Amino acid sequence: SFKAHYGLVTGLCVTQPRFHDKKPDLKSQNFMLSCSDDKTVKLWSINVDDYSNKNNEEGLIRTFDGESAFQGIDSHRENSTFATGGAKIHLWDVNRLKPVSDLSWGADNITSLKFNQNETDILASTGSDNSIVLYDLRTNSPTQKIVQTMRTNAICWNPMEAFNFVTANEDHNAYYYDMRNLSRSLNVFKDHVSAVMDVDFSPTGDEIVTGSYDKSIRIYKTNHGHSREIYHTKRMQHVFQVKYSMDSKY
Amino acid sequence: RHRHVPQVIKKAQEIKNIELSSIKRREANERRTRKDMPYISERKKQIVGTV
Amino acid sequence: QFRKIESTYKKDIERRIGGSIKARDKEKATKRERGLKISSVGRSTRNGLIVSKRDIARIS
Amino acid sequence: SSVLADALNAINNAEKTGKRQVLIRPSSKVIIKFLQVMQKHGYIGEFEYIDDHRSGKIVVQLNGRLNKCGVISPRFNVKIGDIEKWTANLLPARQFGYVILTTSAGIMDHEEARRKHVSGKILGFVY
Amino acid sequence: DTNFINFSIQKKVDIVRGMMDCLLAKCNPLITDCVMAELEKLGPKYRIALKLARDPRIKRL
Amino acid sequence: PQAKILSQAPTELELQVAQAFVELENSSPELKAELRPLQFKSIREIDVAGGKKALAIFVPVPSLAGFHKVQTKLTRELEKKFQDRHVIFLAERRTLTAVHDKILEDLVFPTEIVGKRVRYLVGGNKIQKVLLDSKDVQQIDYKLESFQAVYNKLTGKQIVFEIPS
């Protein structure tokens, strides 16, 4: 465990970073990448015990500065890149402590962001003035901003399709989109009752788990558009983040 | 289909389903009176617009 | 409870229905637990919390 | 005064009903500079103002993280060496639950009143 | 138990240094996994007493 | 119309509107008829984020109510000589923030605004946004940066504008 930040943790990712001076021990150590509330991004080396080949550096390898509050973080699937989100989105390099490349529509704010799995240089983000934005890293420019009725919370990409993503709009709805045409949403899911906090694809690209402010977790298939299962307990209250497993069984 | 949901979910869903069905027939009488309004798809009703 | 009428009179179904539905009657007659009170200084009103001047003078 | 009264009690049943979007009429500037203090300390999120040209209207998004907010009545005077007793009076915990006071710096939070070494004037409490 | 927890919140006394006054000797509290499961099964109206229960100074077993 | 309507002539840019007063006079049936009670006092020079710049011309408000309909007519005959330029027709007056929004609404009187917006963000700072008017907006999109750039030069506070559509 690590007492990371004095503020609220607003984001977390794991990755295998690459540094120019040395390649870190990815086998014996995994790597968090946190995101604070008070202008702080911190790397964390985490010792694991999945390998008996080995037998220090127990945590806090590097820190990153900030001028405004950060609301979210997402790590690129390749080339050890990651971008923050908050009052102003800017990309970050592991080897560079400087703010690398700053992006904005005008004066706008961001509550979450998510890289895709395939065609990996596509970074999507959710704005705060009910807006969903898209970027392409290899073009070094954002693409567009689809605006909605009222704001959303979370986005995650389909791993098997790579142009489809699920958005969690703070009514009782989750929306299924396509990057080619954003005006025709491919599917909707409307089986909740309150604001939805999180959505996560299955790694087999078939089912989408989700969770809302009412104490419930909905699972639905991609095609059906209605929740096939509801999980709930009295011992749960107000789920905020829900993810699949990596083998889609948990 | 049947699953045990709490009454916190169930009671508010009843109010939502009453209000949503209220919205449906309050648009249907507008559909009968007005001649040809746009038949907006439910996949398109949640977008204010694009760029 | 329901209304004891001629329909249940000739049907003789008070012995199989039990007119006062005792599970809904129990959960309605049982008052719910309130919020866990903490701030024992004054009286909860529309204007937040109101304490007496004697309580102010005895704590100053 | 009364504009302070009807603001916060409408907030702290809305979190009991769990409504995401809430509306606050009327609008003054002392409720305006109060309302980021819980946002600074992490109880609420983002919020707005609608300005119809009589007094205004506050649009507030809610993210949970609020058990009870409330002003104190009547007018409360406080010294610098009294707040720790006031925490024992009308506040549950010792590490969380946050009280406020207005000084020459304005409304701000009570442990930095000791850091700025200034007495003030207490109006409310948040826990 | 919960009735110890909820009344201590009602009577303005925190656990660890509050146990110091009566028993007067050094003592550390431990809460079973069964109790904290049902204490937090009380729901939303006791979540501040939930927060005082989960604490690195209160041991758990 | 050369050295009489100028109000401390000998700086640079008011001589350019001194000669821009001259050809505006000899359209005599209607144009010099409304040109009688005007009096312009000063120029302030404004830089924008682009390589182009902005100019502002100022009045002591003797007859601004009559000057309001003068302003909208004077637009179409001024970029024909001030090509690749923008001019804004303003004033200065002597609670101070309640004064400040008045010079904003004389600044934006072509397609006057209907709403005002701020947000208090999670970094503890402040942004503020202006809700505009949706009538003939095909020039303001190229020049809402110009009404952006005059006022942070005037005050320092950073504004946002956005049209409804």
Domain extents in chain F = 1-165
A234 neighbourhood in chain B, CB within 8 Å: 6
Q: Are F108 and F137 in contact (CB under 8 A)?
A: no
Q: Which of C33, C34, C36 sits opposite E9 (nearest CB)?
A: C36
Indicate left, alpha or beta for F116 from its phi (over 0: left) and psi (-120 to 50: alpha). beta
CA-CA distances (angstroms) from residue D124 to A81, A182, D26, D65, F66? 46, 47, 18, 18, 53
Residues of D within 8 A of E9 (CB-CB) are 92
Helices (H), chain A: none
Interface residues of E toward A, Cβ cutoff 8 Å, are 37, 40-41, 43-44, 47
Give yes or no for a contact between F115 and F163, defined as CB atoms under 8 angstroms apart. no
Say if residue D112 is exposed, middle or buried (CB neighbours under 10 Å; 0-12, 13-18, 19+): exposed
Backbone angles phi, psi at A212, to 5 degrees: -125, 180
| Chains touching E, CB cut-off 8 Å, 3+ pairs | A, C, D
Residue C36 vs residues A62, A179, F122: alpha-carbon distances, Å:
44, 50, 31
Which amino acid does the sequence have at F1? P
Whole-angstrom Cα distance, residue D33 to residue D107? 7
Give the C-alpha distances (Å, rounded to integers) separating C22 from A171, C8, C18, C30: 38, 19, 8, 12
Q: Please, which experimental method was used?
A: cryo-EM
Contacts of E41 in chain A (CB under 8 A): 234-235
The closest of A119, A106, A150, A115 to A134, measured between CA atoms, is: A115
Question: CA-to-CA distance for B36 and B28, rounded, in angstroms?
Answer: 12
DSSP for residue D126: E
Q: Tell me how far the alpha carbon of residue C3 is from its chain's centroid.
A: 24
Phi-psi region of B46 (alpha: psi -120 to 50; beta: other; left: phi over 0): alpha
Rg (CA), chain E: 11
CB A143, CB A134: distance < 8 Å: yes
Q: How many Å apart are CA A175 and CA A189, to the nearest integer? A: 6
Phi and psi dihedrals of A47, rounded to 5? -75, 130
Using an 8 Å CB-CB cutoff, list residues of chain F that contact chain A.
119, 121-125, 127, 129, 158, 160, 162
Find, in chain D, the residue whose alpha carbon is nearest to that of A37. D42
Mutate to test the interface with D, among A70, A172, A213, A216 (most CBs of D within 10 A): A213
Is residue D34 a contact partner of residue D100, using CB atoms and an 8 Å limit? yes
Q: Pick from D20, D46, D64: which is nearest to A170 by CB?
A: D20
| Interchain pair F122, A39: CB under 8 A | no
Q: Which helix (H) or strand (E) holds A47?
A: strand A41-47
Give the helix ranges, DSSP H, for chain D. Answer: 2-17, 30-34, 37-40, 83-90, 110-115
Report the alpha-carbon distance of residue E30 to residue A150 in Å, rounded. Answer: 46
Nearest by CB to A106, from F121, F123, F160: name it.
Answer: F160
- The SS3 assignment for F107 reads helix
Look at D46 and F124 and tell me if their CB atoms are within 8 Å. Answer: no
Contact: A193, B16; criterion CB under 8 Å:
yes
Q: Mutating which of B17, B46, B48, B51 best tests the A interface, going by the most A Cβ atoms within 10 A?
A: B46
Q: Would you give the end-to-end CA distance of chain C in angstroms?
A: 57
**E28 within 8 A of E59, measured Cβ to Cβ:** yes
Q: Find chain A residues with C-beta within 8 A of B18's C-beta.
A: none
Give me the residues paired with residue F57 across strands. F43, F89
Rounded to 5 degrees, what angle do the CA atoms D8, D12, D15 make? 135
Give the integer Cα–Cα distance in Å for E33 and A90. Answer: 44
Q: Is the CB of A69 less than 8 angstroms away from the CB of F121?
A: yes
How many inter-chain contacts (D to E, CB under 8 Å) are there?
Answer: 13
End-to-end C-alpha distance for chain B, whole angstroms: 41
Find residue A92's DSSP bridge partners: A82
Q: Within an 8 Å CB–CB cutoff, is residue E45 touching chain C?
A: yes
Residue B34: DSSP 8-state: S
Q: How far is CA D94 from CA A143, A225, C38, D65, D98, in A?
A: 50, 48, 13, 18, 9
Chain A hits for B42, CB-CB cut-off 8 Å, are: 188
Q: What is the four-CA torsion angle of A237, A242, A245, A250, rounded to 10 degrees?
A: 30
CB D70 within 8 A of CB D8: yes
- Residues 1-60 of chain C whose Cβ lies under 8 A from any Cβ of chain D: 38-39, 41-42, 45-51, 56, 59-60
Query: Are E43 and A237 an interchain contact pair (Cβ–Cβ within 8 Å)?
Result: yes
Find all residues with CB under 8 Å of B43, minimum gap 6, and list them.
A184, A185, A186, A187, A188
Q: In the C/D pair of chains, how many CB contacts fall below 8 A?
A: 39
Check the CA dihedral F30-F36-F38-F40 and report its sign. Answer: positive
Distance CA F91, CA C13 (A): 90
Chains A and D physically touch (3 or more Cβ atom pairs below 8 Å): yes
Tell me which chain B residues have a C-beta less than 8 angstroms from the C-beta of A169: 46
As to burial, measured by CB atoms within 10 angstroms (0-12 exposed, 13-18 middle, 19+ buried), residue D37 is middle
- How many other CB atoms are found less than 10 A from the CB of residue A148? 21
Please state the separation of Cα F59 from the chain's center in Å.
11
Residues A74, A126 contacting (CB under 8 angstroms): no
Q: How far apart are CA E53 and CA E14, in angstroms?
A: 10
Q: Please state whether at least 3 CB pairs lie below 8 Å between chains D and C.
A: yes
Four-CA torsion A154, D50, F122, D95, nearest 10 degrees: -100
Q: Which of F59, F36, F33, F57 is nearest to F45 (CA)?
A: F57
DSSP secondary structure string, F50-104?
A: SSSEEEEEEE--SSHHHHHHHHHHHSTTTTTTSTT--EEEEE----HHHHHHHHH
Q: Which of F118, F119, F121, F128 to mutate to test the interface with A (most CBs of A within 10 A)?
A: F121
Q: Tell which of C31, C36, C38, C41 to mutate to test the E interface (max E CBs under 10 Å).
A: C36
Give Cα separations from A239 to A220, A236, E50, F55 (angstroms): 17, 7, 17, 56
